[PDB]
Symmetry: D2
């Protein structure tokens, strides 16, 4: 079809890279059944990188059948669990050995500064190595009462899971969906993001070396509304895992519900940053900045609502504004930058639209709002203020580099304000007074609370939203609760 399984790619920073194509089923790279293809575009070159075979419903079905066999033939299940664990551990090491290209690849796929993409690579590796350690720790329970009966409970894997990957931090999105599944004996039919698919497929070449038997991991990519329904509406799949926009979330929920499937979801949201008169402003400023510009602002918990205690208001804003002048924005393959590119023009247009809405509803613009020149998806960062609590700009999700700063008069009041919304994912607190910190942390309702820090992740700590914003958890030991179900056996003994 004039599309060889691999294509040589030249990377801008001196690297030779061979990029695979096709779908990955039963550990083989294959062309799509209908012979369709689509073009992959570089976000800060505005140019073609390569062509990838496009999957369709026909291939989705094959992947499902493969996953079934992998589970039902017992090769992944009827084992000494320690072996399930060892294979994952090795895979993690194989990845570590190729770090230089992997970081470069991600940078190419999404514009994330190379200076930080490296961080995620290290994080994902530690995550995988750790989670492998649970393979032989998933215990059942003995219920012992009386002298005539025996009772036990045992945990079992649910079956085939369908999973959807977004495009914010592809490496982590990958690991958080696959490792919790594999470790308990589940198999996966995974949908890769269409806009940034390359790194996800590349790393699959190591699966056969790690020794994961064919059929356990199946990777399919193609356009979302097509592939998505092909997976979520199939009768075989038992569980559905999705992250994204609220409206989509509801829609998926209605369809999945029809089959009585188990469904987990994570939506985006908004979060407060409460700054008290006790904290050193110099430190608070650096933390607030990180929290709103990191990864081009395309972050699920990069809250924009900043509340500053009145007595320090004047200085927080004086310094914050001036500090922003130094945020170097530019080439993703330049270790000196901080801000990179946006994923595509879609999001770019959306962001700019809201900037204009803000100006018309009556928000005061302090800085930015301009496109950063004519080429590449870049936006000059903004600050808004003197925004009344009823403004649309403080209810809506921007998912970009826009921050709004308002006033704070009393602790009880800030708590009440912080809690008045449907999007309970995270919150941050800046102070030194032990009483205040404990009080606020235990009264503000959010998935997670960060004290004198922000965007600080660790593999042992769970993450997910409190009410409307979501159902289930992405990380740590508790994450495993949603991949398992409990069976119970009771027996009567005559004597």
């Amino acid at each position: 079809s004039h599309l060889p399984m691999t294509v040589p790619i030249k990377l801008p920073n001196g690297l030779e890279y061979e990029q695979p194509t096709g779908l990955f089923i039963n550990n083989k790279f294959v062309p799509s059944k209908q012979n369709k293809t689509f073009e992959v575009i570089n976000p800060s070159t505005e140019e073609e990188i390569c062509h990838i075979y496009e999957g369709r419903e026909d291939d989705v079905e094959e992947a499902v059948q493969a996953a079934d066999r992998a589970f039902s033939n017992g090769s992944w299940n009827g084992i000494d669990p320690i072996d399930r664990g060892k294979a994952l551990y090795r895979l993690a090491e194989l990845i570590e050995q190729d770090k230089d290209v992997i970081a470069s690849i991600e940078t190419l796929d999404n514009g994330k500064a190379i200076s930080s993409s490296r961080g995620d690579v290290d994080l994902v590796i530690n995550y995988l190595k750790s989670s492998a350690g649970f393979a032989d720790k998933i215990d059942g329970r003995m219920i012992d009462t009386g002298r005539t009966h025996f009772s036990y409970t045992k945990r079992q894997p649910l079956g085939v899971c369908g999973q959807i990957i977004p495009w914010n931090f592809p490496l982590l999105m990958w690991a958080w969906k696959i490792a919790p599944a594999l470790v308990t004996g589940n198999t996966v039919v995974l949908k890769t993001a269409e806009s940034t698919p390359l790194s996800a497929l590349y790393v699959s070449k190591y699966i056969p070396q790690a020794g994961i038997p064919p059929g356990v991991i199946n990777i399919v990519s193609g356009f979302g509304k097509i592939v998505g329904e092909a997976i979520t509406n199939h009768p075989k799949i038992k569980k559905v895992a999705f992250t994204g926009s609220t409206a989509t979330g509801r829609h998926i929920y209605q369809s999945a519900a029809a089959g009585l499937k188990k469904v987990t979801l994570e939506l985006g949201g908004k979060s407060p940053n409460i700054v008290f008169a006790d904290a050193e402003l110099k430190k608070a400023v650096q933390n607030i900045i990180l929290g709103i510009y990191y990864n081009s602002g395309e972050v699920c918990c990069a809250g924009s609502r900043v509340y500053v205690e009145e007595s320090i208001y004047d200085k927080f804003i004086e310094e914050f504004k001036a500090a922003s002048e130094s945020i170097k924005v530019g080439d993703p393959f330049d270790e000196s930058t901080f801000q990179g590119a946006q994923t595509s023009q879609m999001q770019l247009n959306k962001i700019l639209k809201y900037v204009d809405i803000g100006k018309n509803e009556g928000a005061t613009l302090i800085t930015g709002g301009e496109r950063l020149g004519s080429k590449g998806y870049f936006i000059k960062p903004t600050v808004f203020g003197d925004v009344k609590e009823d403004m649309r700009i403080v209810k809506e999700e921007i998912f970009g580099p826009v921050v709004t700063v308002t006033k704070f008069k009393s602790a009880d009041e800030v708590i009440n304000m912080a809690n008045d919304s449907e999007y309970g994912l995270a919150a941050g607190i800046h102070t030194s007074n032990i009483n205040t910190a404990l009080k606020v942390a235990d009264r503000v309702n959010a998935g997670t609370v960060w004290i004198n820090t922000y965007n600080d992740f660790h593999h042992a700590v769970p993450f997910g939203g409190f009410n409307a914003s979501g159902l289930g958890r992405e990380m740590s030991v508790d994450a495993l609760q949603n991949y398992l179900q409990v069976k119970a056996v009771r027996a009567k003994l005559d004597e």
Copy 2:
């Protein structure tokens, strides 16, 4: 309205009973806002007992607002948990003290033989006393890594839950819905069954003595399709708990899903009884009988599929048939009976319809199928056989006193047969060979497996369905997992 808050009821076995009416909100008995009423009928007299005020949407809304205040004013939450526990414990004792009438009341409400209704009263009491013990045991977790950070996780109550009660075993249905909620700090708006509402309201008179503050428990009754939607579609309710028919289950799921609510469900199902040549037939026969006639057959796990190993087939059926001749059926207030009445003519007609279908599709009738005379909802118990695996009668749910017996040739084959269905709630095994018992129990897929016993319940043991048949668990410690969610806090320490 000519409906006093209480009415004297004379019970047939020498008891004086005062029956309350009205709705129970903020610990008060009140008349319904629209002044509507409906009549309560005696299942084996075919006669009127009393009139109850009928609730409507207007009252449902009030109950919701009450529940909200109970939660948000902190009186139930900001406490030393041990006190939450103590109040529940006392309530259980107050109930124990009135056992004689309570058993009589249930008998009046549903036709269950008095000889067994007593059992459930004792079971529910032990259940409640035990679960009270978790009030101060619901611990969080400390995550300790590095020397610069602190991490903890804490469990929090979800909020207001809506709950629906069926009509099979009202006392237990009550306890399994309320106690897991109360123990963690949740409040409840509960819908009582319309056909058998009396015992559920009577026992509420003790709530004010136990000391549960007003607003925590709200009891509303009225017609299902009205009240039901009034609760499930309200924006305040966070969780929905429902049990019932498969079709209804799906419907509720679609509506609840629209609000991204947390939804748990239990459907009915079917179950096998696998009888091996190793077991003593005399014992197997008594266990099989219990499993199909207990509580008039209106039992969620009273499986009708009986598989008998070929070498003993002739004797199992000879004895089983003859044994059934002794199952005394009659007056619910007669300690000598075994079988009581059916809930209503609706179910009666349904059962008889299927008996006729069986005869026409080609099933062989061994015994029964007749109505047991002209008065009261009674059915003469049946046995079918020589039924091919494709028959409608072995796919459908009867939910009544109908059993089908077939042949078994080989253990691998019975396992494969047992698993071929969507309704995975329970299974039973009858044998003496340790190898066989362990093999089958770990290969037949079901919510729960009973060895050499049947319908044997204990408060420490969990219960619920494996795949299609349900989501979540009704009893024991693991039940609490679905009433709680986890929050996490991470903090950075400078030094």
Copy 3:
């Protein structure tokens, strides 16, 4: 023998009390086999209260044999654990109903102000009710690997335990030794303190009502060096529980070790109070005072080492001294007092001896050291200062109302000082800076750390010493670990 089983006692505050005598074996009150007796003396009257039969080795042996039967006949063990739990719960209620006399009795036994004895009664009741809740929560574990094996672990009670009661807080000492035993199925041969034996026996009259079968609880009293060896050196007893002086602790350890017994111990110790410039002095002063005068100073963790940050030194001491002038000392049956009497002249002489040593080695006396008049065991409270770290007075245990205050220059230094000793039971911190509190708490080594509070107990929180000072824990769920051992069973399945 002219000693009736009961004697009328008149209590000074209008109460009629009947006091039992004899030993309590198999739920019966019996006279001692050798017909010996001893006199009980009132600590602040200096006068005889009553005579109690004195036990001997002969009776100790009977108690042991009784305990054996209680265990081995299965009546306490082969049950639905929930029943073990219920009996304990009731016993706790029976005690609650008689609170007025119980508080008065303790006051009579040890001089503790009535104003605080009431507190311990409430605490012990909550403790017992809570721990009863574990009767049916002590679970085993299912180990599930491979497809050919089965593995489980189950916890079992150790057997007959011997226990020793000290004389500081008899009600709690009682509960902390008995309830953890009973809840798991162990039986106990308990030695009651000889100097303050009355309340311990009185409450035993309720055991037969609660429904604890005879032989489970056996109460014997008599002189320590006799009865003690009679228990610790017997071949039947499996576990030994002791609290007391360091030297005694070692001695018991050497004897118990000879039989390979399981031995737990708690010794007294010393603790620092670190006061920072950040804390409000008014609050710090009240907490420091409580911590050194509560319960006449006869408290295992009433640390005397006070470290005050230099910048506030002058005011801490000015206020502290003046504040002490208000500590009313007097009649135990006067709600207005704070300080009561010492247990006996033995301890009184010991305390005074050390005061004199202090004066001679060179400590500066600020106040007190005088006997508080000629009648009753009362001591005027003291304060010392300008005491060099090498002084004997800051190495030795006083176990009385003596406090020493020194200087603090730097946080690292105070941590290093705090940790330089063998007696690691507790520590306290007074501040408002979250960083400091977290740092110190995680660097000072002690059994337990209290922040901005002192002597603040709760049934859910564990307690015991870090290194030399002890082995094992007195309270909360973890306490149960030392009353149980684990059995494991593994089985191979052919198919």
Copy 4:
């Protein structure tokens, strides 16, 4: 001293091996301070292998000081625990890569057939890899009550542990003592067995590659009564771990007790094998044989008490005797052998002495008792029978290839017999009846029970003795409980 740090060793099966000498302190190989040496002898050649420097008290002290620094400088402790884990994992792989020599070395050290030494190498590797997985799973607990307080508990490493290695299975003895320590942050001063020291030192060469910082692992060897006291009586060591003979156990307990140290111990013991008429004799015979001849009989749980149900007695003994004729005994470096050599002439003489006692007290000898020729420590295996329950031979520990077979009449009686002793380490059951197996397993008291299997180990399953025979556990997750202690912190919040 004419002793180079390494010596070339030629192995009989074609291998070139370089053997190190000296002590291993701070990751260096050093000569002993007093320049003493001793000779290593080959058990089935009766000949010199090499000379090893002999350690003394002076070196023991250095090792202790090194361990202290390793702990107190924080390099092993103040880390992200995941790194502690990774280093151990790598070490395990380095060992796996050198399996061929390691198995050969052990064979040289103790005469164990090469055909089975390989098994232990594989077992130890899996064990180490698994336990590494707990590095970041050792969690603390959050206690959450009220609204004014905070409570947490955290686990901390005890400190420097002293450990003693026996000579039965050196590879496992090594791993079971070191890995549970390292994983929690403890450091170790280890005493290597004097009679079989070589493999233990060889493997230490990989510690520096794994990356374990110097001072964490210190290996010292020399004569037992000297080195032993040097460690157990030192004031720095906090914990003592010992396995061995009962008398020694008691002695160590008395000394360690003097310092209030934490002491764990495992003694040998005896165990029953209960054979029922239901089991296939062919299988029972093979399992009984393994259980008494494996590893030359020098096994802690190789029980010799065989009880055979009367109805099958004649055939069990006919077959068992004949079967023993095939147990090939010979050269350790011959894959076809089953039985190898005894450790030394000491044990050889002891065994033979008991054979003679048996003959004189009146036991009937069925077979063996002869020395297997004049060269090498070999014994021809024996069988005794018609031995009355009072015979010394059935009370004493042989720790060699001697089995006694008696009669069994009734299940209750065998249970009562099985339990009549102080040495409760293990028991085995042979049957097919589920009721019998469950009954006996839950009535016979032993550390562990094996059903239709024997000597079947797995890393996830715990092991240790029930009463007299020991205190503590060697394997699995529960083993970690004795290397940690709990600290608790409570804090009061003003608001």
